[PDB]
Coordinates of C-alpha atoms in Angstrom, one line a residue:
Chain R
X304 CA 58.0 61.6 -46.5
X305 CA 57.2 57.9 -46.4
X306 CA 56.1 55.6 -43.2
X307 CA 56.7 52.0 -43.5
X308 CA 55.6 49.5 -40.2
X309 CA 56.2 46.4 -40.0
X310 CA 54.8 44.4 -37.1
X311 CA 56.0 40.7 -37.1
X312 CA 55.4 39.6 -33.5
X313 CA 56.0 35.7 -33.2
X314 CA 54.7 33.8 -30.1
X315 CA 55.3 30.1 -29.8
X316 CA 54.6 30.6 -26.2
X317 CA 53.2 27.4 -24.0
X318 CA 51.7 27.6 -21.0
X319 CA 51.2 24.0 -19.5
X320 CA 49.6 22.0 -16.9
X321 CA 50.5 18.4 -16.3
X322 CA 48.7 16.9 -13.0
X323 CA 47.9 13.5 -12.1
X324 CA 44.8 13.2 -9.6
X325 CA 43.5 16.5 -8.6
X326 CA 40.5 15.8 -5.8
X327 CA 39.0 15.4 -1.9
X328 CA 39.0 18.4 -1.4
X329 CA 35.9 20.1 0.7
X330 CA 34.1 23.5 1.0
X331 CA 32.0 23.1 4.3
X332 CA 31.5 27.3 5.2
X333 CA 29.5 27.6 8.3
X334 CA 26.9 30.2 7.2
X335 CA 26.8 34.2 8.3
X336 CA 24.7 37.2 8.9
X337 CA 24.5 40.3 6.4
X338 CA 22.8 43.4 6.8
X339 CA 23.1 46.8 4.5
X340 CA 21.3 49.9 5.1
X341 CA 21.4 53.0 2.2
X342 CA 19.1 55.9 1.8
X343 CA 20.0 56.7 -1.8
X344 CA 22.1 54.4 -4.8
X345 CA 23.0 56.0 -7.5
X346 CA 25.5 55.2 -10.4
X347 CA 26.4 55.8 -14.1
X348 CA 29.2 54.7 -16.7
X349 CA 30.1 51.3 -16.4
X350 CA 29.6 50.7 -12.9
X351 CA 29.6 47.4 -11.6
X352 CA 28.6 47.0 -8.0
X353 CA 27.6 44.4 -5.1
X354 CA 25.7 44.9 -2.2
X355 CA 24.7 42.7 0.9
X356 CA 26.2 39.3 -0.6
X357 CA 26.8 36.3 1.5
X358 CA 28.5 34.1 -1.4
X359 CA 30.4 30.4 -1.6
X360 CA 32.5 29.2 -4.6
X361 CA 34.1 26.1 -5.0
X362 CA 36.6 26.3 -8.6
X363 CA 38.5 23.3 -9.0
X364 CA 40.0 23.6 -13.0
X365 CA 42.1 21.0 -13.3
X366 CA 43.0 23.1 -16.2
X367 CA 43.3 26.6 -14.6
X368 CA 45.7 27.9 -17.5
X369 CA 44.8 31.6 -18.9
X370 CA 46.7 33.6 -21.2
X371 CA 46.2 36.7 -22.0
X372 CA 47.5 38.9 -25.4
X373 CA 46.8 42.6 -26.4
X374 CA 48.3 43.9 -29.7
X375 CA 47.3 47.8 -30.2
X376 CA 48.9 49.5 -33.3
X377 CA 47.9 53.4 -33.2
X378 CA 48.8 55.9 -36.0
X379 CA 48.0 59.3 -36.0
X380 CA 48.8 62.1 -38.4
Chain U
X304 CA 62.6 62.2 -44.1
X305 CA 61.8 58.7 -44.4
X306 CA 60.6 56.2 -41.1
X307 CA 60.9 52.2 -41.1
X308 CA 60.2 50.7 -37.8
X309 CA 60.4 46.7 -37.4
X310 CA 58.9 45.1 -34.5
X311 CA 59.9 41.5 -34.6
X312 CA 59.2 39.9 -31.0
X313 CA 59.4 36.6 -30.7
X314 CA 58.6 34.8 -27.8
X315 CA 59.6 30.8 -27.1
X316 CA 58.5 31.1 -23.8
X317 CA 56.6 28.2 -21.4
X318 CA 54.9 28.9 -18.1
X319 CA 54.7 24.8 -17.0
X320 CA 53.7 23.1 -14.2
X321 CA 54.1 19.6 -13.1
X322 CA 52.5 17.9 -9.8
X323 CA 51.8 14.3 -9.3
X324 CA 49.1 14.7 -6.9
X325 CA 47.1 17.7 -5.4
X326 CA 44.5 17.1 -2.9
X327 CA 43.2 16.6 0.8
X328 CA 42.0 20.4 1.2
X329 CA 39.6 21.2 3.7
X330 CA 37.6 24.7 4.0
X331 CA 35.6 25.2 6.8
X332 CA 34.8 28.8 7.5
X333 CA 33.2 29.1 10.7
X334 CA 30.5 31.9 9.4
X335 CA 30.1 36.2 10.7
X336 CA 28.5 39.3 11.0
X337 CA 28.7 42.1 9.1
X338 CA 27.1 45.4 9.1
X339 CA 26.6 48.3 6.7
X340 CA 24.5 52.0 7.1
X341 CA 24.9 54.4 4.8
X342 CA 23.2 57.4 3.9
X343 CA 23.6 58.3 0.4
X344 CA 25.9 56.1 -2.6
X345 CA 26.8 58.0 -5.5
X346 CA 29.4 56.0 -8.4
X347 CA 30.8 56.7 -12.3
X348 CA 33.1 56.1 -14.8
X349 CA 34.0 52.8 -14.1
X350 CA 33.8 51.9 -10.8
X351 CA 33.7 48.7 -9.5
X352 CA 32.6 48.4 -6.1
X353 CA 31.9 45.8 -3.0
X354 CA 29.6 46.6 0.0
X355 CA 28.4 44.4 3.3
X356 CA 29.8 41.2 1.6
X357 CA 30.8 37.9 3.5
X358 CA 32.3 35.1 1.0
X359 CA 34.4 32.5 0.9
X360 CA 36.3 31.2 -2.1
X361 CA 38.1 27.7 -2.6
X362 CA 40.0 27.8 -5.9
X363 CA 42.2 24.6 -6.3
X364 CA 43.6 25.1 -10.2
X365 CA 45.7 22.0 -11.2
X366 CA 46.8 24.4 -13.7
X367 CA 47.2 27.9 -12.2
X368 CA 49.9 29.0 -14.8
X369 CA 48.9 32.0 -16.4
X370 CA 51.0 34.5 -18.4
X371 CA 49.8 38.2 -19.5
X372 CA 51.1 39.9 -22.7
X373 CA 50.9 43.4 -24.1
X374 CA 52.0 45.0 -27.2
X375 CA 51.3 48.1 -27.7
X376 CA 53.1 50.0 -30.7
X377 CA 52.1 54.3 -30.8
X378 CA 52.7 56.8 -33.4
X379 CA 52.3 60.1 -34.0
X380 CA 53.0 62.6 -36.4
Chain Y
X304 CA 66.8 63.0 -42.0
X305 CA 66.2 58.7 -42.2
X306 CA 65.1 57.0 -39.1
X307 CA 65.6 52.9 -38.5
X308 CA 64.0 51.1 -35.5
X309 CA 64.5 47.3 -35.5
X310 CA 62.8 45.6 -32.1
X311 CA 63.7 42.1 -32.0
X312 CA 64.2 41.4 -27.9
X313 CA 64.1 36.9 -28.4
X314 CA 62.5 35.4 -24.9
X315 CA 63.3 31.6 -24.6
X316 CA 62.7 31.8 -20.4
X317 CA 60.8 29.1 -19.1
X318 CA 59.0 29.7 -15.5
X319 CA 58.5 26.3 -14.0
X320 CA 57.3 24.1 -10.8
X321 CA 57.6 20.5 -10.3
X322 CA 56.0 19.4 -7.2
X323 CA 55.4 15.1 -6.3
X324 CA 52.5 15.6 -4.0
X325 CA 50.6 18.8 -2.8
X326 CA 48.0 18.8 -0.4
X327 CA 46.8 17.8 3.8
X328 CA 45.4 21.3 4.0
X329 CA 43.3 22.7 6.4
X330 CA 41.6 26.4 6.7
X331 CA 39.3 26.6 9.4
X332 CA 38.3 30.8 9.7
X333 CA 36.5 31.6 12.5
X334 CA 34.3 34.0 12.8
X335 CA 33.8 37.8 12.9
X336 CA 32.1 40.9 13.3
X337 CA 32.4 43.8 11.3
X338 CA 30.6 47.5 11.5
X339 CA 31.3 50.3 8.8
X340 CA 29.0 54.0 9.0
X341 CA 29.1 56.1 6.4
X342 CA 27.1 59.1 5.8
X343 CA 27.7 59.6 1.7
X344 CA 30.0 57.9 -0.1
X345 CA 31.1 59.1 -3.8
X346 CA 33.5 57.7 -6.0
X347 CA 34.7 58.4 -10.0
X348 CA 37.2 57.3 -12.7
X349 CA 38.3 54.2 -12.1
X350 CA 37.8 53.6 -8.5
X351 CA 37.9 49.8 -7.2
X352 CA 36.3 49.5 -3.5
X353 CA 35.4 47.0 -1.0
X354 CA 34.0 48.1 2.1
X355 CA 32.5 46.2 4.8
X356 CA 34.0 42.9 4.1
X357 CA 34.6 39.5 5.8
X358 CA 35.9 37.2 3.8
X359 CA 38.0 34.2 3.0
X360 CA 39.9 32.5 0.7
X361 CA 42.1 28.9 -0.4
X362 CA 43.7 29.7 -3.2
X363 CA 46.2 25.9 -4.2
X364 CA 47.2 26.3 -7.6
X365 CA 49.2 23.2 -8.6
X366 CA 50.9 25.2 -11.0
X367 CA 51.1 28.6 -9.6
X368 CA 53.4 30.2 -12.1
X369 CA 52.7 33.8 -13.7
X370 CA 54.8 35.4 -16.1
X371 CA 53.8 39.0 -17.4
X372 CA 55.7 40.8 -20.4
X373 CA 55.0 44.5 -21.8
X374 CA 56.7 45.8 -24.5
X375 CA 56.0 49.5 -25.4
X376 CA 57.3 51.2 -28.9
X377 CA 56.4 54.5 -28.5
X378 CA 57.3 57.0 -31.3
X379 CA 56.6 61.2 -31.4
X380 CA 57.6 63.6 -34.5
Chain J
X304 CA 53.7 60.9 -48.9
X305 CA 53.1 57.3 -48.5
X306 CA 51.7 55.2 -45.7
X307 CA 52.5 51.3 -45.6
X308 CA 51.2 49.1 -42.6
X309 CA 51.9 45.6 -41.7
X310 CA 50.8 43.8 -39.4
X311 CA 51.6 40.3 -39.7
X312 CA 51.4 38.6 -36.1
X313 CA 51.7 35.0 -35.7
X314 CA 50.6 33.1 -32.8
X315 CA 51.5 29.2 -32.8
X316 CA 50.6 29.2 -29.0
X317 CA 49.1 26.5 -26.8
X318 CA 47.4 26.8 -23.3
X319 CA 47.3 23.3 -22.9
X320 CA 46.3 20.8 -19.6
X321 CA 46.6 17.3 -18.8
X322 CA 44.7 15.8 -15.5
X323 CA 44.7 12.0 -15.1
X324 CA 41.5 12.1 -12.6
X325 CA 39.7 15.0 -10.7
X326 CA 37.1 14.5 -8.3
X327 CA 35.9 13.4 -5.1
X328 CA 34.4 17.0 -4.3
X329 CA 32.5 18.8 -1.7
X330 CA 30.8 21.9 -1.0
X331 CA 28.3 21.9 1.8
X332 CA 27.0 25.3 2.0
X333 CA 25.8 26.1 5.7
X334 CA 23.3 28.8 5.0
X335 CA 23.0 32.4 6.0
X336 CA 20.9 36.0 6.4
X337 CA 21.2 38.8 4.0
X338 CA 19.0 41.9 4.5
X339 CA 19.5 45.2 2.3
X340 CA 17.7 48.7 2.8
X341 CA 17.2 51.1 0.6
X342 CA 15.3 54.2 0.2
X343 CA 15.7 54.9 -4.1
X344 CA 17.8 52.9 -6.4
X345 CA 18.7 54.9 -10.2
X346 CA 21.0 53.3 -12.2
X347 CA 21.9 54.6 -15.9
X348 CA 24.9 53.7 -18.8
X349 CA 25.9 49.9 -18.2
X350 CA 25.5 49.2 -15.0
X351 CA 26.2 45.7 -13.3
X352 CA 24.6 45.2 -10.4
X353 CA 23.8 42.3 -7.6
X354 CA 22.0 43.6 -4.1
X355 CA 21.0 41.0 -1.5
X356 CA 22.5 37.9 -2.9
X357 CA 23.3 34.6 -1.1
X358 CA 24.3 32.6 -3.9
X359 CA 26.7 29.0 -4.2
X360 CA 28.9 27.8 -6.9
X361 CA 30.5 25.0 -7.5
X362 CA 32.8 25.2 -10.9
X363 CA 34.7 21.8 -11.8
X364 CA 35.9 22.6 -15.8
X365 CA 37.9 19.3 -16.4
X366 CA 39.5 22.0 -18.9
X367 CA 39.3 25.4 -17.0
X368 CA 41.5 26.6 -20.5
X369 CA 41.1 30.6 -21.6
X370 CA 42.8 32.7 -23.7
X371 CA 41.9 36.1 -24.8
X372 CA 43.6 37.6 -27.6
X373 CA 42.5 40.9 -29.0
X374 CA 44.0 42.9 -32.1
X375 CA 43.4 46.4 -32.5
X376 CA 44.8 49.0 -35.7
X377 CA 43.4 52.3 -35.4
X378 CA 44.3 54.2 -38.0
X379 CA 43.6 58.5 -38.2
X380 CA 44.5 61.3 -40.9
Chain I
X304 CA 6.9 6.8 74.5
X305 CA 5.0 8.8 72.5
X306 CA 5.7 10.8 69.2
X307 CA 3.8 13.8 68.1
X308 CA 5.1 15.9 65.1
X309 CA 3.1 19.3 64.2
X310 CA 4.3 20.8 60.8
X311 CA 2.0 23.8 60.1
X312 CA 4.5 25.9 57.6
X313 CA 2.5 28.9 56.4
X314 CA 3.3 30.8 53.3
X315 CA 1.8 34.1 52.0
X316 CA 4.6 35.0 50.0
X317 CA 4.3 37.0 46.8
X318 CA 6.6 37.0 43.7
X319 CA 6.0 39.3 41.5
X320 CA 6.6 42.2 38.8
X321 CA 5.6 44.8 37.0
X322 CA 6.6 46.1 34.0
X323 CA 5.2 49.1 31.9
X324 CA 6.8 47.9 28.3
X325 CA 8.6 45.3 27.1
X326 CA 9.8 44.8 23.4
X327 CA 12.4 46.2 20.6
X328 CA 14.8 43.3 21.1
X329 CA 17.1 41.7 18.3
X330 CA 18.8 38.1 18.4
X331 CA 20.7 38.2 14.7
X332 CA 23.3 34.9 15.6
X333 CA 26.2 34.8 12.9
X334 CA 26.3 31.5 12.6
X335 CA 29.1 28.9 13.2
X336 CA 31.1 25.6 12.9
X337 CA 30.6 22.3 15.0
X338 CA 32.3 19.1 14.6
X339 CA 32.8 16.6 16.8
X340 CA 34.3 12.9 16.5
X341 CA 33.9 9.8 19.1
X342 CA 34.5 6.3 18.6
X343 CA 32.7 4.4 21.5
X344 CA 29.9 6.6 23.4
X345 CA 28.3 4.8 26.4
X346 CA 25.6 6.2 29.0
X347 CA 23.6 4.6 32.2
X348 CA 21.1 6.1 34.7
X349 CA 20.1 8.8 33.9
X350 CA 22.3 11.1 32.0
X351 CA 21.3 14.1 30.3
X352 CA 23.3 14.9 27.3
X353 CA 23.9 17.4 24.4
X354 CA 26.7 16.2 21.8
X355 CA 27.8 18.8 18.6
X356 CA 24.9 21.6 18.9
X357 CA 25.0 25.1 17.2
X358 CA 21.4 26.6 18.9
X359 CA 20.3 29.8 19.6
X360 CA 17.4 31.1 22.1
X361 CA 15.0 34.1 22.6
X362 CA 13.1 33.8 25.6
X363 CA 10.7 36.7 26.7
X364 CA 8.6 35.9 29.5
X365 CA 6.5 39.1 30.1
X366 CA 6.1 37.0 33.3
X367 CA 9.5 35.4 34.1
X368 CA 8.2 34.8 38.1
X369 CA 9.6 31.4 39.4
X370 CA 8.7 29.9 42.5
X371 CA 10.4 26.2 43.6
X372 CA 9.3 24.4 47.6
X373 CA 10.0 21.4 48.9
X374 CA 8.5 20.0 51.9
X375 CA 10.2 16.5 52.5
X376 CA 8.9 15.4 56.2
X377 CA 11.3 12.0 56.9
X378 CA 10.2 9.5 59.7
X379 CA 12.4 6.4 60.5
X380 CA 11.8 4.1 63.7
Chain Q
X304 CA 4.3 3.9 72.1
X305 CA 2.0 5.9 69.9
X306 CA 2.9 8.2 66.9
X307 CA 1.2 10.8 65.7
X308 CA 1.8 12.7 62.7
X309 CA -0.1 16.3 61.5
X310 CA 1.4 17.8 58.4
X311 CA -0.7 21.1 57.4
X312 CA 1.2 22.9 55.5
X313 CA -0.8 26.4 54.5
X314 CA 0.2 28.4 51.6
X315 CA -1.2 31.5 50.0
X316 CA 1.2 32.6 47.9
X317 CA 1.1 34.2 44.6
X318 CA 3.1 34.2 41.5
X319 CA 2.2 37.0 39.7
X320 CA 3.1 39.5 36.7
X321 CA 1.9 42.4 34.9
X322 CA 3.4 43.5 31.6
X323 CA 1.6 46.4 29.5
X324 CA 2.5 45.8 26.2
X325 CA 5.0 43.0 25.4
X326 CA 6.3 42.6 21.6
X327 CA 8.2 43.8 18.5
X328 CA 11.0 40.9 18.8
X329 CA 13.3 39.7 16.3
X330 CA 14.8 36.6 15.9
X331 CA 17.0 36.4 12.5
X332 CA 19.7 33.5 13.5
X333 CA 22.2 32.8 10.4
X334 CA 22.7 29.4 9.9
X335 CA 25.3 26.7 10.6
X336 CA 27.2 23.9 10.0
X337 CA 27.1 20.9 12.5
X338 CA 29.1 17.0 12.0
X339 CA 29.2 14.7 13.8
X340 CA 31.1 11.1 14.4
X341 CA 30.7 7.9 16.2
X342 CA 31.2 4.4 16.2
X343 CA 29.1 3.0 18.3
X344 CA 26.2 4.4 20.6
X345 CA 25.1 2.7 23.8
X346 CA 22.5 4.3 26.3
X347 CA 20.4 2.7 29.2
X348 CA 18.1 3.5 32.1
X349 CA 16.6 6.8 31.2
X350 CA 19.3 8.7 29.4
X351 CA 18.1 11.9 27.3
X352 CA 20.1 12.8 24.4
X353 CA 20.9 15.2 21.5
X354 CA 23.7 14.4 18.8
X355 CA 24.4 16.8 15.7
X356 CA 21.5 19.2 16.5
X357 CA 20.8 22.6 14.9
X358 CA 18.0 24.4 16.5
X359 CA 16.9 27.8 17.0
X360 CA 14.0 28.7 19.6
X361 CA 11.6 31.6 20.6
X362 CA 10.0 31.4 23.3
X363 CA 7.5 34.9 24.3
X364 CA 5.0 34.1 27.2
X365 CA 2.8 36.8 28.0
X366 CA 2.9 34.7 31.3
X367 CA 5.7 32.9 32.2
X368 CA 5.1 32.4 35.9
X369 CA 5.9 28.7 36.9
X370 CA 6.0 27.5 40.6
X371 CA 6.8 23.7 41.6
X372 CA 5.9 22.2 45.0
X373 CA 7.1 18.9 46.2
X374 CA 5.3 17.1 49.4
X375 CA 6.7 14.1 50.6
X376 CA 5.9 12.2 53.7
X377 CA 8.0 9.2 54.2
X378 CA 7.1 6.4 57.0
X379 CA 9.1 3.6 58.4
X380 CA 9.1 1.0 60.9

């Protein structure tokens, strides 16, 4: 009782940005008020958490390209 | 009883972009108020949480192209 | 009792954008007020959560284009 | 009975951007208030955690290229 | 021809208050977004101005008793 | 032709407060964002003015009792 796998996957795969100027470009946010109020936290296994955040970002990539790939092969008897 | 599995994907693919100029982008948040109480928090396995949060994001990717890609191959006896 | 899988699916698709200018844009949020009350909050496996939120985003990708490709071989005796 | 695994992927990919000039950016940050209350924080097994943040970010990758690629063969009698 | 003018005003007026407790008062502003744009600005006797202001008060007078008189006595031949 | 003028103007008045216990006042504002644009300013002959101003006040008199009292006596031939 034989088991023979073969796992060829071939990716010539091109993901591609092409962009000439990229720019003036302005992040002018106007400020705020927060407030958070807890007794108890508590928290286990791989938790991830924010709490009472006031919080600017400015990405400009001119790249910006992601790509993302997961081979799983799984054998059980 | 004999098994022979192929797995021969290919992929020629291309996720493109093209854009001559990108620009002239204004973000002007005009700023807020946000309130929380709580009593008791209790998290696990995995959670991913946000509380009381005011934020402003400017994301201007010349790129942007982004492509997601999963083999998964299973077997069992 | 002989078993043959071949799995050769070819992908030559190409998911594009051409775009001469992009831009003259203008996000100008104003303002809020936002009130959550919670006596006890709890949460497990996997949970994603956002409570209490003001927020706001400019998201100008350029590119823009997402492509997003699962291939499952699943195989049981 | 025999067991014969291959795994042979090939990846001639190429996340890939071209930007002739990116620039002439802003982000002016107006300010803000954050308060948080608590009584007892615990935390345990990998926890992530940010409480009372106010916090700016200004990200300009020229590049701005990822790819994440991640093989797994799990093999059990 | 004679003139003879008498102005005896009296006053015993009382303004006044009374006030047992005072206090526990909040003024959390959320902040905001002011722009303004002018070419040519020109003033002359006596103007009072405010151009493009985000401001915030918190006046408590404990007192808070105000008390305005004019006597204007006018003689023309 | 004679003239004759007798201004006596009495007062006995009283501005006046009382105020046990005045306090426990909060004044959290949350910041802004303020711009503003000219050519060309001009002013003359007692103007008062305020451009682009971002200002936050607290103001907690115990007293706060004000009273203003203008005489004028005005002759002419």
């Amino acid at each position: 009782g034989s088991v023979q796998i073969v796992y060829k996957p071939v990716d010539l795969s091109k993901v591609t940005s092409k962009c000439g100027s990229l720019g003036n470009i302005h992040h002018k946010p106007g400020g705020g008020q927060v407030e958070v109020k807890s007794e108890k936290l508590d928290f286990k296994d791989r938790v991830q958490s924010k709490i009472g955040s006031l919080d600017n970002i400015t990405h400009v990539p001119g790249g910006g390209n992601k790509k993302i790939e997961t081979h799983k092969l799984t054998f059980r008897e």
